[PDB]
Write a protein that binds this ligand. Structure first.
Ligand SMILES: NC(=O)c1ccc[n+]([C@@H]2O[C@H](COP(=O)([O-])OP(=O)(O)OC[C@H]3O[C@@H](n4cnc5c(N)ncnc54)[C@H](OP(=O)(O)O)[C@@H]3O)[C@@H](O)[C@H]2O)c1
Ligand SMILES: O=C(O)COc1cc(F)ccc1C(=S)NCc1ccc(Br)cc1F
Ligand SMILES: [Br-]
Length: 312
């Protein structure tokens, strides 16, 4: 299967990337170095993950060592919710660029549709625990994203955690200059996203699947929660193909024409997770995995559920 998918900006995006949310700052530099050494060419980043400087050390070292050329890498980051103001977007992007040791991003996403009050805190709260919104709307933030393309800071722009109506709002924007290239959403066998994926794909927007392994290290995991990696039905499909469960869970979205961004800081798993281009799930395997949908969402947040633009 081809390693890259064509975006609606004319550029090609590697269908497998390395996730970096929760990667400790003392481990992520080696994780990214190992990833690039074993073939990864796409890294998924965000300012809110608080480790872009350390990711950037790795990227810069591999560029300096001439392991890879900058043109061969596809580096993604995301505009955090407290920077959805016209006068803050460029600086937010520039801080990410500075930390990553880059002079452009391949793709910059609106991380969540909701804007929050600017300030030091990533989740500004009122005295009763509700997030404090910004009155900025997704259309004006999109215009600010378009400026970044026109200034040369980013090659593509996109969205993340946008629901169908929010994607449609962007597409219907008066005076729209650049369509979103990507919508990055949670997607795995327990949250299969058929409806949103078909909408986005019908509009030429590429979907990236986050938390493809079910984010077992998410900080709010509970003992009793469902576990993709331990699901005996998925293990059985893996065994039949002489692959690991994680490898099946990565190949699944690839065959749906999705990009997928599994996270690891374990060198052996980084390498294992990349070994997914030499086997095929059958149609029956694919439909069987789709059948496990339970609308189980790992990435959600109670404090933000009253924001006007909360997506879920
Ligand atoms: N746009 C957004 O709002 C958003 C939200 C969530 C995630 N994301 C992006 O998507 C990435 C991936 O999602 P995620 O981090 O939530 O979770 P994930 O990739 O579904 O799962 C990561 C977990 O799986 C473990 N793991 C990785 N490979 C494994 C393997 N081969 N066998 C067993 N366990 C394995 C990792 O352990 P070790 O690291 O200990 O090896 C880690 O605990 C994030 O890192 C981030 O880049 C974006
Ligand atoms: O967001 C990530 O990439 C991964 O998750 C996070 C990663 C971080 F570094 C910090 C917080 C989150 C949380 S708690 N994210 C959920 C979340 C945030 C904002 C809104 Br609007 C809704 C929502 F559900
Ligand atoms: Br949100």
């Amino acid at each position: 299967m081809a390693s890259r998918i064509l975006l609606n900006n004319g550029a090609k995006m590697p269908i497998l990337g390395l996730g970096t949310w929760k990667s400790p700052p003392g481990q992520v530099t080696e994780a990214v170095k190992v990833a690039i050494d074993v073939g990864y060419r796409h890294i998924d980043c965000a300012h809110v993950y608080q480790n872009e400087n350390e990711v950037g050390v790795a990227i810069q070292e591999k560029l300096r060592e001439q392991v890879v050329k900058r043109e061969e890498l596809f580096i993604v980051s995301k505009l955090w919710c407290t920077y959805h103001e016209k006068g803050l977007v460029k600086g937010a992007c520039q801080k990410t660029l500075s930390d990553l040791k880059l002079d452009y991003l391949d793709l910059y996403l609106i991380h969540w549709p909701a804007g929050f009050k600017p300030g030091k805190e990533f989740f500004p709260l009122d005295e009763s625990g509700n997030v404090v919104p910004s009155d900025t709307n997704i259309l004006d933030t999109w215009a600010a994203m378009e400026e970044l393309v026109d200034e040369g800071l980013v090659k593509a722009i996109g969205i993340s955690n946008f629901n169908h109506l929010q994607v449609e709002m962007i597409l219907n924007k008066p005076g729209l200059k650049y369509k979103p290239a990507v919508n990055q959403i949670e997607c795995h066998p327990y949250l299969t996203q058929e409806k949103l994926i078909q909408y986005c794909q019908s509009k030429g927007i590429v979907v990236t699947a986050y938390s493809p392994l079910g984010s077992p290290d998410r900080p709010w995991a509970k003992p009793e929660d469902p576990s993709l990696l331990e699901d005996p039905r998925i293990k059985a499909i893996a065994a039949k193909h002489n692959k690991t469960t994680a490898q099946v869970l990565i190949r699944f979205p690839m065959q749906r024409n999705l990009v997928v961004i599994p996270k690891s800081v374990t060198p052996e798993r980084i390498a294992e997770n990349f070994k997914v281009f030499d086997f095929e799930l059958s149609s029956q395997d694919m439909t069987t995995l789709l059948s496990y949908n339970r609308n189980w969402r790992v990435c959600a947040l109670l404090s933000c559920t009253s924001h006007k633009d909360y997506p879920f």
